[PDB]
C-alpha cells in the first residue's frame, strides 16, 4: 500500500492472503464474507494479457495473518479452494469491468480473534455512506512503492472517496458504474494509495449508525501508484451484490 502503516494486530480480521501454492508466492488479497466464502479481484485469477490463469488448485488462501512473511503456526489458517466464481461479464479486455471473483473454500473456517467476516453493504448503508468526502480504509501486503519494497506486515491507509467527474478525468480508461475511485486531490496535501499486489484487498467503511465494518470495494486497477492527480479504482461491491448472491445460495 503506498504511504500508510503497520496494521494494528487483529485490526482487519476479514483480510485474506491469495497465495500461489508453488512457487510459494503472494498474488493478492481477499476478504472473508462468511465462513466458506472469500471475495477477490477476478484479474487476480484470470488476466490473459499477463498469461495469468489459476484454477482452484494453483492457489491456497491464508486467513488470519500479520506478517507478509512468517508462517503464523498458531494464529493463521492455510485453507484450500473448492471452487472459483469469476464474474461472467468481467471485461478484462477493456477496463477490467466487474473485476469481481468468489472462491468457495473446501471446509469452513473457525473464527478467532484474528479471523472474522466483513459485511457486504446494503441498499441504505451503500447509499448513505458512499459519498465524495467520506473515507474508507485500504489494506494490503503489496508494493510499498510505485518503483524502487514490501511490507513485513499488514499496511493500512485511509483515503477519501472522489467525485465521478474527477475520477473520469483522472484517466483515459472507461470508468463505469461498477467502480469508484478514492484518493487525495493534489492540492489536498496528503497521500496514500493501494499499489501492485493489493488487488482483492477490501476497501471498508465503518457505520456511524450501527458501528459495523462494511466492505464497499475491492482493489481493482489504477495507473502508477500515488501519482499526483491520479486516483485509484475500486470495484463497486454493492453494484455487484445480486450476482454475489445468485451464486452463494445457489452454489
Amino acid at each position: 500500500i503506498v504511504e500508510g502503516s503497520d496494521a494494528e494486530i487483529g485490526m482487519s480480521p476479514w483480510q485474506v492472503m491469495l497465495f500461489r501454492k508453488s512457487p510459494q508466492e503472494l498474488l493478492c488479497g481477499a476478504s472473508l464474507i462468511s465462513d466458506r466464502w472469500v471475495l477477490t479481484a477476478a484479474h487476480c485469477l484470470l488476466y490473459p494479457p499477463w498469461d495469468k490463469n489459476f484454477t482452484e488448485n494453483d492457489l491456497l488462501v491464508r486467513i488470519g495473518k500479520h506478517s507478509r512473511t512468517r508462517y503464523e503456526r498458531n494464529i493463521e489458517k492455510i485453507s484450500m479452494l473448492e471452487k472459483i466464481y469469476i464474474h461472467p461479464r468481467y471485461n478484462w479486455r477493456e477496463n477490467l469491468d466487474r473485476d469481481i471473483a468468489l472462491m468457495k473454500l473446501k471446509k469452513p473456517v473457525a473464527f478467532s480473534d484474528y479471523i472474522h467476516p466483513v459485511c457486504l453493504p446494503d441498499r441504505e448503508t451503500a447509499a448513505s455512506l458512499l459519498q465524495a468526502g467520506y473515507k474508507g480504509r485500504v489494506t494490503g501486503w503489496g508494493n510499498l512503492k510505485e518503483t524502487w519494497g514490501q511490507p513485513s506486515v499488514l499496511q493500512v491507509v485511509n483515503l477519501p472517496i472522489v467525485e465521478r467527474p474527477v475520477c473520469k478525468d483522472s484517466t483515459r480508461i472507461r470508468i463505469t458504474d461498477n467502480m469508484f475511485c478514492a484518493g487525495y486531490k493534489p492540492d489536498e496535501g496528503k497521500r496514500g494509495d493501494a499499489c501492485e499486489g493489493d488487488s482483492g484487498g477490501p476497501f471498508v467503511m465503518k457505520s456511524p449508525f450501527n458501528n459495523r465494518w462494511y466492505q464497499m470495494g475491492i482493489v481493482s486497477w489504477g495507473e502508477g501508484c500515488d501519482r499526483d492527480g491520479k486516483y485509484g479504482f475500486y470495484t463497486h461491491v454493492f453494484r455487484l451484490k445480486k450476482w454475489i448472491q445468485k451464486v452463494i445460495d445457489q452454489f
Partner: peptide, 30 residues
Amino acid sequence: GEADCGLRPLFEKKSLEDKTERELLESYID
C-alpha cells in the same frame, strides 16, 4: 457465517478504538 459480521473481537467487542478508526468517523460528521 456472518450476522455477527463486521465487529472486531479485539476492538468493537473489547470496546477499543483502533488508532485511526476515528479519522474516518469524523470524515462523515465533519
